[PDB]
Design a protein around this ligand. Structure first.
Ligand SMILES: [Zn+2]
Ligand SMILES: [Zn+2]
Lengths: 330, 330
């Protein structure tokens, strides 16, 4: 039999991300000899981006390709299924945690409880911030109306004095154009350029060379399927889909990075100034971030289990010291 | 029909690498519904490790899973299909170069001329060095009889004054034991421990925290199949094997990294001391390395094509400056 799944992505039509997503649907068809076809839908075509979770749960959408931390408000563990401020910051570290340190199994158990099947993470990129005004040091975040993807990312910036707001990436351009917000994080350079942020914001704010991305160094996406639909798919096809997603994870990653290399010269051409924060600004964010990591970990049994193993890993590779964990518990 | 392929790996029996490789053949069987069965063979079981290239070319072996730079002496481009001293040093950078910047197509074209189908790279790990006597700085390399995997890696150490020797990892232990060599690089901590290096060498030599691996930060493996055997495989199975290898690339990478985390405590227990070189030491190696990059790049049309796009990429991410390239050119 042939199966057809309808999957909407967080990528807006007309972005490098959507183009990569379109090709993935062709690859799935090739890998399953046409037995499984995925019909792609750009952000907002079936439902709003943040409404994808419920639509996939009901089966109205067969699956979704979101940025995983979008569900942080309803599933605490998802704040730990994508990068959070100053924690693990390399694609290979997240890949290791998910694929050998138990991360994938935590995600699958948590999503199964929601009637969803978490297939696996899709590698992507770090994120940058676009601002209408110069933010040159930690203290300049005070009073900035900043769009961020909620969750722990928003909490960290709020602890730095920013007024945070949650908006889908597609609403950032009009918000900055009208001055409804002063700044916005979204994704990396290439897609932000596709969305025109450079024309409504003259600055790009990044961390120092040592920590380019303070908040989201590894902004993971994923594929999540309605559990019933997943369980109805023949096992051989389920296994091929898992392989297709893991292969795509890196094909997506590479395509985004190539587009990013091409985008930087364009920002310079557009007259956009890239502001680099300092190592000291990062330390100020670090002191705010660690206690917040623990508060989020303490939300439910899944966030605790995921952070516990991530913390152990961070200790093993020198990303956290016992001294800085003083007074914190788990 | 059902296809059966014998594929030998550079991993010795009894290593974490070989266990991961055995699992991959089961994964291939599952992904192809039993149509493609790869019978795994540990290093030296069918042919010698360095004989795999000719064994596969002539068909004695259907395919191989080697460390790609083993063929540097016969195919100059392979010295650029795996990490080399002080160039790109993160797994994600090599993934990007191969999958979006044209790297994969260069490898495939170069191998096709040899009657081989290069499937894709297999991520792995950085490498560390084990020594019988301490090597605490750049100058301590003079006079050291050092085992390395030849090619550009051997040439950089020779430039530092070491007497290099080429040996399969499975022959490092006896070579150290009987004093044939003073030190040896091979792979990461877990597998080196599997091979018992800690029993014949009390030191591990690594770069500073900023540059843990000076010579081989991304020691890639790959799958290469006899071209005729590849062409006789139905296209649907060719595509599934390609996806399987790419998925495995990271499953392998993650498994190796987990094992590495578990190995450090065993080295401490075995009484092995980890010596870290300095940033100054890295600079001394750097001044030798860069000119060597160009020497190897100019070897043939493929080594030139590969290095050309890698240099362009490194320039793009600030890994090299025009200043330090003064007087060097393709
Ligand atoms: Zn973001
Ligand atoms: Zn090596």
């Amino acid at each position: 039999r042939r199966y057809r799944w309808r999957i909407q992505t967080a990528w807006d039509a007309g972005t490098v991300g959507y183009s990569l997503f379109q090709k993935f649907t062709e690859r799935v068809k090739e890998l399953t000899d046409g037995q499984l076809e995925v019909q792609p839908f750009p952000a907002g075509a079936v439902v709003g981006t943040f409404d994808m979770f419920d639509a996939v749960k009901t089966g109205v959408l067969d699956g979704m390709n979101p940025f995983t931390l979008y569900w942080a408000g309803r599933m605490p563990v998802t704040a730990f299924l994508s990068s959070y401020a100053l924690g693990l910051d390399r694609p290979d570290q997240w890949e290791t945690w998910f694929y050998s340190l138990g991360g994938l199994d935590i995600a699958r158990r948590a999503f199964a409880e929601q009637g969803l099947f978490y297939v696996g993470p899709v590698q992507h990129d770090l994120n940058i911030i676009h601002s209408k005004k110069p933010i040159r040091r930690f203290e300049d975040f005070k009073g900035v109306k900043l769009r961020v993807p909620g969750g722990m990312i928003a909490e960290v910036f709020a602890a730095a004095g920013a007024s945070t707001v949650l908006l889908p990436g597609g609403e950032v351009y009009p918000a900055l154009e009208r001055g409804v917000i002063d700044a916005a994080d979204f994704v990396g350079p290439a897609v932000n350029y596709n969305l025109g942020f450079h024309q409504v914001a003259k600055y790009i704010i990044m961390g120092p060379p040592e920590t380019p991305a303070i908040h989201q160094p590894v902004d993971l996406m994923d594929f999540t399927i309605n559990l019933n639909r997943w369980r109805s798919l023949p096992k051989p096809l389920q296994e091929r889909f898992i392989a297709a997603v893991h292969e795509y994870s890196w094909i997506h990653y590479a395509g985004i990075q190539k587009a990013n290399l091409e985008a930087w010269p364009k920002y310079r051409q557009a007259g956009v100034e890239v502001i680099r924060l300092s190592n000291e600004d990062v330390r100020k964010f670090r002191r705010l971030a660690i206690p917040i990591w623990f508060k989020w970990a303490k939300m439910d049994k899944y966030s605790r289990e995921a952070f516990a193993s991530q913390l152990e890993y961070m200790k093993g590779i020198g990303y956290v010291t016992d001294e800085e964990l003083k007074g914190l518990s788990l």
